[PDB]
């Protein structure tokens, strides 16, 4: 069958590109993916990463995870009730994701049904020729043939996959693909990285996990959330630790074997030992090109394994073309969907746009969350003559009544201090995600921080702090930081 | 008893020009207020209306009214417990509240002591000339004079006060000054007036209400929330509605009796009845001049009674200025500090700048929250020839799984469709006060609607949707609604 388009992943980049070549400039679009709903034995399906076993489900269990702290603070606004009587069911928690989850399959599924020119095809797409992609019944290359789809374009858009640390014992961890899935809440749980899965994770499940269970979170480097504001990663470091998830930092684990009744015994390369249920692997995630036969086209590879792309998402061969995860630049839904965007725009389009990955909005769901947009100030420093860093640390007043006096928030204002420019905003506490994207909005329009200070503030909120500092905290100066 | 300049009124503005000229333009600063710290007789204090019986006590109190909410949707996502042992603590309640309020009272204390020419007189500001305050011992003009401060330049910065209606029994009503503290939560309460502190009480007391409680809001017109966008109007009315409040909607109460049992038998207009524990009158604040005396150096006041200024804060009397509430303009306390920071950059900085009163965000603590910036679509209809209506409204999944299904999220841009710049944006649910602030920033860089549009989404938020609107819902067209342009 013959396609203007296929596109190999039906997730978020993938289904954005395939939706707009089709409808918006009438193209027939084919449209490969593995499963048609979330979960086992493949875990990303119809909808992508985000939507199966990311974004989507993760924000809900940390919806969740929040009314641990919500029950707790309610007493210090005059709520009581029987505190012996809470119980937090994972099984209840698990089981309304799954029907949401599925639900968002069951409307893609809809979309392609109802969508003339857009088809969707089940299975493993790969390259057999340049303007050929194989849908087979698996990821062996030997599988039966279902579908054979001729393509004047071809799109890569096969997202990331959890990286596994080759080490012995390896097959008695999970990644956050089965954290998913799992059907009992761990009593005690390790999760392994100190990036935005390992953090979320650690407080879905220090709030679900049963009577004297315990959250452990270990991380090789000495403070968890490299490539976030510095003063944001330590007191996410002392929050998570005040609600009673343990940070082993400077440690990673050497090896796992099963004690006797089948917990999980793990040994650091420090030779401490911790004893869990669980051991959550969120070290990293790898581009999705094993499975591709790109060996068929000769599609430049990095070493790494993702597939390497101009700034409009091309290929070294004409006709195909990668965005998203598999691209590895930035790993973010709404990316992938302005890579997508971008992309069938100036091929189908020839309105020439690529995807600007600076100032790029982002959140982490930790409890309390993170929002931020541009550069932390180190790396601002070493691109910037002279760098003024605007800070305003304290802990809200409902903090103080609610009990939660380590909830310390934090809002950063990072500038160009010749000309006031804001070149980062980093902000630590409720509403944070929220807040911070229409700052991506301000960035985009070179807003300075005299755009900031002379915004009337919106009061009583946690965001008006950006619109009340007048007056640099310190500087970096050639790269050097001044009081 | 000689100053640069003598502020009446410790507020939101007359706090943020006291400081602003003794620490940045080392001038000497008198500030003048009635009471050291909250609440009875006078309420309002050092701080000022917002910190003492505002903005500050209101967003502790509709935290606390959200756990009713947060106890409800937590069962959707597996929490469980005794539903049956659920207590709302109004007395625990209001003592957190007075601690924290309290605590801010003595953090200004603080602030006064430790700050060179800044210095706190107690005790009732009035003018007696134009280079001349005097303090009395209480509002009357005729009490003792505790002192007299010669002044270069006098800022009035008196704010705001409840109006009540003068119907029969309007004395067995209460403002929102007594509504923080009332001793035990009404089981049933009537709010009399449409706008933010009426809807935003009616919250308070719905959450923190005894068994058999019912919050009854009432509104002279047909939809409350005059000067907000129309659709947030009627969606905060029925999500309201589906949190148990009744809303009564062209009804206005035309006398209060005693019960015998202290109750309140209201009658209305109408000639509908209710019986009610509270009825709390929340329809109009006027400003607070009365007391100033200000026909003694003739200081000019509005058809409305708030001093007449012009951009600078400036009366019509050399050295007098006056900002806040009691220009009866936008009560709000940021457009107050704003303006007390603009008047003391201009006088004393030699730095003249004037406070916009355009797109200024602002919010209203309902459940869930409005938060808005700049222009209603209706408004700015009759001043652009072309308007886009950009409109996004869903209940947001977890609301889903919560089981409150009728917090339906609204994010609204409007456009002037001509060149893409937007004239305003209204949100309504959960995190919009937080939300529209930055919008507030986007708005002063005169933002397009493909400013937002190309911006790319955090996912997943509410705030988002703003980065995800493309094509108008409809347009008006020299005033005209319509689908589709011509
Ligand atoms: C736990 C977790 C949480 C996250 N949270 C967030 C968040 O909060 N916000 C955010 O912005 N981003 C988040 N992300 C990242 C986000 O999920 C990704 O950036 C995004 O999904 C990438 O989109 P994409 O189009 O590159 O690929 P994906 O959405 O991953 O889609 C790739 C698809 O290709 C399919 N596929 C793979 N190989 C083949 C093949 N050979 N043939 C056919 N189909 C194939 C897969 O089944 C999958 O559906 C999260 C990721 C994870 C893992
Ligand atoms: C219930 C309620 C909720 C509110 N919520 C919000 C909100 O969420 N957000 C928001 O932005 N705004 C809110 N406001 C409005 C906000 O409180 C005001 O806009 C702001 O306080 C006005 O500041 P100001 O400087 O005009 O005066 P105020 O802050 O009102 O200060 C005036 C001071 O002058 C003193 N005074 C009066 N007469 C004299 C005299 N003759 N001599 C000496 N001292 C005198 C008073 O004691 C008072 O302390 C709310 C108001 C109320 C009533
Ligand atoms: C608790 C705390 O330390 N902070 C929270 C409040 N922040 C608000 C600053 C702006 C503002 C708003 C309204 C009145 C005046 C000023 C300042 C820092
Ligand atoms: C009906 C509903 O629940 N809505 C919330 C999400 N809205 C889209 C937000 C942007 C986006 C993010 C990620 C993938 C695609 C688009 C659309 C409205
Ligand atoms: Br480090
Ligand atoms: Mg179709
Ligand atoms: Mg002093």
Redesign the pocket.
Known sequence: KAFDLVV???????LEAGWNAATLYGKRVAV????TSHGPP?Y???????V????VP??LMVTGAQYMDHLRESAGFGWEFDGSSVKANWKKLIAAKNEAVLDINKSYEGMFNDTEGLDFFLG???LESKNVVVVRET?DPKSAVKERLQADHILL????WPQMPAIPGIEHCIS?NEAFYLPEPPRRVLTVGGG??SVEFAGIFNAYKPPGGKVTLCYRNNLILRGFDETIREEVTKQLTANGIEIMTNENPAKVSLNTDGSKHVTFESGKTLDVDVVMMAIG?IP?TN??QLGNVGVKLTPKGGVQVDEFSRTNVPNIYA????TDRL??????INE?AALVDTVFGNKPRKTDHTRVA??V?SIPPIGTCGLIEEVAAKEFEKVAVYMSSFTPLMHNISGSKYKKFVAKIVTNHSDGTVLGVHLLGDGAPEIIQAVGVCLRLNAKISDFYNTIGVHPTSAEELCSMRTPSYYYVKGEKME
Request: net charge positive; with cysteine; proline share 2%.
């Open positions: 190999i992943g039906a997730g978020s980049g993938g490969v993916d593995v499963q493949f990303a399906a119809l909808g992508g990463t985000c199966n076993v990311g974004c993760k924000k493993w797409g790969s990821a858009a096969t997202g990331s956050s935005f899965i995630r999705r499975d591709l965005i998203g995860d598999i790993m973010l839904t709404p990316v992938a997508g982002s959140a769901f």
